[PDB]
Ligand SMILES: *[C@@H]1O[C@H](CO)[C@@H](O)[C@H](O)[C@H]1NC(C)=O
């Protein structure tokens with residue numbers, strides 16, 4: 001799809017001065033991001049936008 | 058304050074209470090009279106005498 | 114009046 | 130066909146015949162002919178020769194083992210045989226049923242036991258319920274101690290509470306060594322809970338030394354894995370009373386019963402294989418020829434042999450040949466040197482025979498800790514709320530306390546409320562510990578010719594030390610039970626329909642009105658009824674025809690129109706008119722309170738705490754935390 005607005009203008013201005021090249025892709029789950037305890041385990045896992053960043057996506 | 062405000066004139070109590078506490082008789086440490094005094098006070102409360110005394 | 118400290122409708126759950 | 134092998138006991142010739150007899154016991158959906166062998170002594174060559182000859186001359190599909198005098202290094206030979214000949218075996222008992230973690234790749238052992246970490250989980254479960262959290266770890270120089278010391282630290286980070294660890298010690302507890310060094314090391318310690326991992330002989334040596342250096346009295350507690358404890362039918366000397374362990378299900382069955390369970394598992398596996406393909410695979414027992422690359426047929430059979438159930442007992446084997454999700458049972462040494470069950474474990478929830486850890490002594494008369502007591506209470510919605518534990522994780526939601534409605538069998542509810550928060554704060558300030566249990570009989574108190582029921586009765590007959598909750602103060606109660614300072618002030622109040630100028634109003638003073646006869650409340654066997662009767666006879670006489678079940682039905686009756694007036698306590702009534710369907714109201718208000726008293730913490734007479742916890746209650750009332758609790762728990766809309 002095509003995106004535009006506040007954060008996109010900020011992103012263009014940010015990318016101009018530092019010479020990186022972006023590839024914008026939206027979120028999968030659609031949730032802002034929280035910490036959740038997966039059943040049958042105490043090792044906490046991050047769900048939502050906070051996971052896509054932490055794993056390496 | 059509540060006695061004098063409604064008693065004389067022209068004075069008002071602002072809002073209501075914020076820190077609540079009671080009134081009680083004072084006696085020296087571990088004196089042998091306290092139990093009977095409390096048993097009399099509770100009996101007075103149950104009779105209605107402190108009620109008759111209060112209106113008076 | 115939906116206050117921030119505590120509303121009785123918010124503090125005590127209601128039906129509507 | 131199947132195979133059976135015995136080892137190293139009282140010669141079970143009659144038991145061998147009993148096992149051989151039921152060729153058609155018909156309890157299994159199969160008719161595989163059973164046979165039996167038996168080795169005189171246990172040794173590598175002996176075992177190899179007997180098994181190789183048997184399966185090479187018998188054409189067997191499965192073989193079930195039965196262990197011996199409990200010597201180590203026996204399961205390895207069986208794993209070797211299974212890996213070579215590709216013949217699945219199964220152990221049922223003894224030392225051979227101890228988990229061999231990194232088994233050979235292509236083998237199929239299927240030994241019934243429990244791993245070390247899984248067996249430590251139940252120990253950290255039982256530690257949680259009694260809230261000891263001392264963690265003095267002792268592990269001998271055993272080939273497996275490096276795994277125990279890592280598993281304990283791994284489970285330490287897979288639980289809620291901090292688990293403050295104190296000291297971990299490894300000492301040479303073998304046959305030969307310097308006793309003085311270990312004496313010095315053991316004499317220098319202080320921790321109310323010990324967890325030790327050793328072997329049977331090492332356990333005996335360690336416990337003898339500990340008994341020498343004063344660590345076995347009624348103060349400390351020991352926990353050991355099932356590797357120790359030996360026979361389970363001959364507890365030796367120097368074993369401390371109260372030693373705790375966790376054994377698996379079927380720690381009391383018979384040998385023949387366990388062999389029967391093994392044959393049942395084999396038969397069910399074969400039958401379940403038939404319902405897919407329809408034939409029991411042919412054997413491969415060329416022990417002398419030793420052939421065989423990877424074989425997909427026996428691989429499919431083994432893959433199918435993992436899972437199995439049997440009338441309540443499920444034996445689900447993990448890839449590693451130890452079963453997963455068993456129903457472990459905790460055991461402990463009773464006061465007469467005899468193992469006894471204490472707590473079950475089914476589906477991740479622990480149970481306990483006792484609400485407290487019964488603690489013994491040298492002369493065997495049991496003692497109760499000074500900083501401990503038993504609290505009673507019961508249900509009143511604004512102050513005491515009972516909630517069944519949710520199916521989330523067994524334990525109750527935080528900021529709640531475990532409570533039980535006693536009556537031997539129990540279901541652990543949990544209690545939440547106002548007085549419960551007060552109790553938590555009191556336990557935090559006065560430095561004591563408690564257990565909370567609800568009452569069974571009449572709600573609050575009465576005297577039917579000296580038979581006092583309720584919390585007042587439970588305190589007067591010396592079965593408890595306090596009684597917290599909705600308990601008012603009056604002259605007749607305070608005669609036999611002491612009381613602290615009040616923290617919530619109540620009285621008598623009248624709720625009506627949204628008409629009277631007090632109790633002394635002629636509508637209540639004179640029940641002689643013709644067309645309308647007014648109607649009353651007075652939940653009987655309660656606090657107010659005593660005063661109402663003893664101070665007004667005619668009202669008591671006319672008050673028989675009054676609705677009396679609870680503070681629940683009275684609201685409905687008032688809203689319907691079958692009652693004209695309700696008389697009850699103040700703190701509950703004025704709260705009940707907080708969040709109501711519409712707005713029903715009471716008379717003038719707090720100006721209409723009769724016999725103004727307060728709630729109180731009931732206590733045993735001449736109790737050393739009374740003075741201890743009156744000051745704390747006064748301190749709490751002083752700085753306004755009670756007002757915060759009031760606005761958190763006692764607020765309404767209308
Ligand atoms: C307290 O009162 C009881 C009777 O209620 C009486 O027997 C006792 O002597 C009294 N004690 C004192 C110290 O007055």
Ligand SMILES: *[C@@H]1O[C@H](CO)[C@@H](O)[C@H](O)[C@H]1NC(C)=O
Pocket residue numbers: 401432433434435436
């Ligand atoms: C597991 O149990 C199911 C249910 O009966 C069965 O069909 C299956 O063969 C068993 N084994 C495997 C590997 O799924």
